[PDB]
Structures are given as structure tokens and as C-alpha cells.
Amino acid sequence: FNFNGLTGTGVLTESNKKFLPFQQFGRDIADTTDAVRDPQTLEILDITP
Amino acid sequence: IGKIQDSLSALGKLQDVVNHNAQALNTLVKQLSSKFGAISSVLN
């Protein structure tokens, strides 16, 4: 996958996180991306390995 | 023997074992975000 610059690999699934209304993606502890927001539909999706 | 529970409700030697391994695994992962004097830190 590539989300407007965010390049990675993994399984995309519906999340249950709530971003702030300016944030695109989230990271976990140790600073690795684990959730993104789809630019078009504005939904948060988890990225699992 | 009944007083033993009161002294518990100690195990720092057991938590230290967990901490030492957790710290080595957290450090091992963090060392991937280092450039070591290269132009970048990502092989792609």
C-alpha cells in the first residue's frame, strides 16, 4: 500500500481508534506506523504485519 | 503463616528479569532508525 506518501506492507482492517480532526496517521510505542486514514473516505484502518 | 499474605498484599527479582528482556527488545527495534553515517536509513 501507499497512502499519499506513506509506503508500507500489511493487512488493512477497520479500526476502533479516534484521531484528532487534523491527524492523518497514528504510530505505536517505538514510533512505527500502525494506523492510517483513507484520504477519500476518511476512515481509520489498522495495519497489521 | 497467616501473616505472610499481609506482607504481600518483594517480587522485584522477578520483575527485573522481565524488565531486562523488555529493554533489550525495545532497544533492538529502536536501533533500526539510525543512519550510521549513510545518506538514509531506509534500504528502499
From Swiss-Prot, chain A:
Superkingdom, taxonomy of origin: Viruses
UniProt-reported outcome of changing residue 7 to K: In strain: Omicron/BA.1
Subunit structure: Binds to host ACE2. RBD also interacts with the N-linked glycan on 'Asn-90' of ACE2. Cleavage of S generates a polybasic C-terminal sequence on S1 that binds to host Neuropilin-1 (NRP1) and Neuropilin-2 (NRP2) receptors. Interacts with host integrin alpha-5/beta-1 (ITGA5:ITGB1) and with ACE2 in complex with integrin alpha-5/beta-1 (ITGA5:ITGB1). May interact via cytoplasmic c-terminus with M protein. May interact (via N-terminus) with host bilirubin and biliverdin, thereby preventing antibody binding to the SARS-CoV-2 spike NTD via an allosteric mechanism.
Job of this protein: Attaches the virion to the cell membrane by interacting with host receptor, initiating the infection. The major receptor is host ACE2. When S2/S2' has been cleaved, binding to the receptor triggers direct fusion at the cell membrane. When S2/S2' has not been cleaved, binding to the receptor results in internalization of the virus by endocytosis using host TFRC and GRM2 and leading to fusion of the virion membrane with the host endosomal membrane. Alternatively, may use NRP1/NRP2 and integrin as entry receptors.
Protein name: Spike protein S1
Region of the whole protein represented: 541 to 589 of 1273
